[PDB]
Paper text:
In this paper we present the X-ray crystal structure of the complete extracellular portion of SIRPγ co-crystallized with the Fab fragment of the OX117 monoclonal antibody, which recognises SIRPα, SIRPβ and SIRPγ. The structure of the complex was solved to 2.5 Å resolution by molecular replacement. The crystallographic asymmetric unit contains a SIRPγ dimer, with each SIRPγ monomer bound to a FabOX117. From the structure it can be seen that the antibody Fab fragment binds to both d1 and d2 of SIRPγ. The light chain variable region (Vl) appears to be inserted between the two domains contacting residues in both d1 and d2, whereas the heavy chain variable domain (Vh) only interacts with d1. R103 forms a network of hydrogen bonds with SIRPγ d1 involving Q8 and E10 in the loop connecting β-strands A1 and A2 and G109 in the G1/G2 loop. The main contact residues for CD47 are in three loops connecting strands B2-C, D-E and F-G1. This suggests that SIRPγ could bind both FabOX117 and CD47 at the same time. Thus, in the superimposition of d1 of SIRPγ onto the d1 of SIRPα (rmsd of 0.60 Å for 105 Cα atoms out of 114 residues), the d2-d3 domains of the two proteins are rotated by 66° with respect to each other. Interestingly, in contrast to the structure of SIRPα alone, the two SIRPγ molecules bound to FabOX117 formed a head-to head dimer in the crystal structure with a contact area of about 1130 Å2 and a Complex Formation Significance Score of 0.78. The results of the AUC analyses imply that self-association of SIRP γ only occurs, if at all, at very high protein concentrations and therefore is unlikely to be physiologically relevant.
Residue numbers in the entry:
A (entry chain E): 2 to 293, 296 to 317
B (entry chain B): 1 to 229
C (entry chain A): 1 to 214
The structure:
Amino acid sequence: EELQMIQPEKLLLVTVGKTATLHCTVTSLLPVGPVLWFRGVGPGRELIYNQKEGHFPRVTTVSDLTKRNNMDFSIRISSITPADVGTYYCVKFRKGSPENVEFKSGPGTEMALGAKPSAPVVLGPAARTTPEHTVSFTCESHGFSPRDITLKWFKNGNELSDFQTNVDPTGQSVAYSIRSTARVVLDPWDVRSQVICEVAHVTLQGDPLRGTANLSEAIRVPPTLEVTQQPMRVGNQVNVTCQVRKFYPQSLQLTWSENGNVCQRETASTLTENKDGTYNWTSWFLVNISDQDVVLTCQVKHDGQLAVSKRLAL
Amino acid sequence: EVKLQQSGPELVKPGASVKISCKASGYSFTSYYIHWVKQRPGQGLEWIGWVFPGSGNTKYNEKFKGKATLTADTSSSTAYMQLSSLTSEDSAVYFCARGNYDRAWFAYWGQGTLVTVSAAKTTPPSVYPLAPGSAAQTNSMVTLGCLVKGYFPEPVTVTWNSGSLSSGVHTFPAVLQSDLYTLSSSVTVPSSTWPSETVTCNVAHPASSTKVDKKIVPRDCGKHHHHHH
Amino acid sequence: DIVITQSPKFMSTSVGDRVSITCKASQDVSTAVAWFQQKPGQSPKLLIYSASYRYTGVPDRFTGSGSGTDFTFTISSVQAEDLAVYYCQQHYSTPWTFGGGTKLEIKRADAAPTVSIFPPSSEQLTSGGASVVCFLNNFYPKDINVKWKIDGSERQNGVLNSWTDQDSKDSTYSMSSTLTLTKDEYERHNSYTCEATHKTSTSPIVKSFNRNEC
Ligand SMILES: *[C@@H]1O[C@H](CO)[C@@H](O)[C@H](O)[C@H]1NC(C)=O
Ligand SMILES: [Cl-]
Ligand SMILES: [Zn+2]
């Protein structure tokens, strides 16, 4: 069993400013002699770390080399800048007569530079749409390398699958871009819902990045209408009320028509919100019942849409 | 020789933690990288991470960030993986492998450890013999079986006559059915050796420290021969 | 995370044929690729490393090749023990990643299934349940049907099937079929039957037993 130089990672990715960990282990403790780190092969190679002699402010050992028994010669190089890219070799020396002679080299680890993607930007449709229609959202992120990236779409907690994604370019680039379009169906319960784009990349290390769009901005929930009469249990009065149910957004004009004529009369009307995020608008008034068949119309204009109405006979 | 022996199957409550172990032998333990690998049943393989014993240096697949923790006890030539806050996504076989050559390739593997994440209680199986009746004579060979019903969790081990019968055995994959697994096993022998010579299915259930040896006896015929109308 | 896509996902081949699995990486991974073999029930076995080197005592018939983004694993002469799932792996950059597998199955000659039916044991009946088991053993090809008849009529509820991995010696499949009902349901009827449908016989194989027999 002769000493071997183990370097698990053929290529190591790192990002500007971060620390790089170069992994190296030995299989045997003999022959006796130091282990050194170099960038490059041949006589022109650069000395990166030396156990005993030399000053290496940027290098820091993973384990305690001073311990007789240590077999791990992995090093951390801090504050990586683009000048640090290269192939780093782990090299064992044995004793000689005056000099030490090279005994065995690891196969080297390439230190390569990657880049984090940008915070994903999710854009919604420009105009609002009623429920039971599918709309499109887009997600983009850019500036990342390498090209391998993962993009997930969610509506609230549920992952969507009705999407297309492209990564660009195909060739070599300093930076790649990811673009995705998701088809999302609008349900009547969707006012409080969020569309999410999740970007996963090796340079992020566990923590993905998220772009969001609120569906509150994409949906119009048309209101439902009804008008009623209530005989005031004590007296010759009628309680006429108009019920504008489950609408979104909160932008509404409600007019009363008496035989097709606008009233202008005083009405006590209140606004309520529903758990589903939609709104309700109640509008009631009392009539002194004179004597002289009146058709009452409750006319509602929601969010700039065509007027809808309901008739009621007294 | 180089051997990696991992600990037995586990049943863990959702949200709880567990620690699989991997005992190494026949080589200097401080000297080689140990890797762990995950396999979700009928799915692919996934590298979890490594530990270099001696330094205790680890490096992870970020997918297992706060999920797995790797450690080693060099004195005991043993390597551990702890898995925290288990969900049903963690149910899988986990392997340990030891590196070889200058890149620590996955060259020597343990036998694997099945981890089942469920809230269901551990249930020893009921073992039922399966003996024929009519066609017991007719043919030169005869098939006998053994039904391993209602057990949890996996796995179960099934041998025949302590393992001496392996000639024509078929142990079948268990079917899950509302918190309980059921499997069958069959053996084929020459008819002149049964019931002349004794035949037994040996069924063990690791999780329940349970073993039953069911001797397959020919059915009782007393009442039949009394009512030959 | 480098993706490795492996082709084909399924392959079936005669004994002694030459076969080739391909593997494609999303990056240039040099020659830092491994090939593994996993037989049913077992852990993976390292076959090839550094794209072309054979590992300690792996047979001559297993070769690897390729460089960059394209790799090939090849069995020169498929043997029956060679059925398994085969995976490529990049061992170039962390996190290390495996391909999706190629399942290898063996083409062989047609074999009729041996069919056997079993009554519930006394032991089981005393519990309150009753299982009738029908074994369909050592057949080829894989495609097969099991019909369950009670008193001559069909039954679907409470039937469970389990299949074996192809046999590594004789290249055949087996099936198990278990019809389970209550004690009382079992008492209420007399003849039970599993029917077998296979490429080999134009007629169904029928095994029956009557609840009163020996
Ligand atoms: C008229 O009825 C509405 C509800 O239908 C109610 O809000 C309102 O208080 C009633 N008017 C009076 C005077 O009670
Ligand atoms: Cl308006
Ligand atoms: Zn009789």
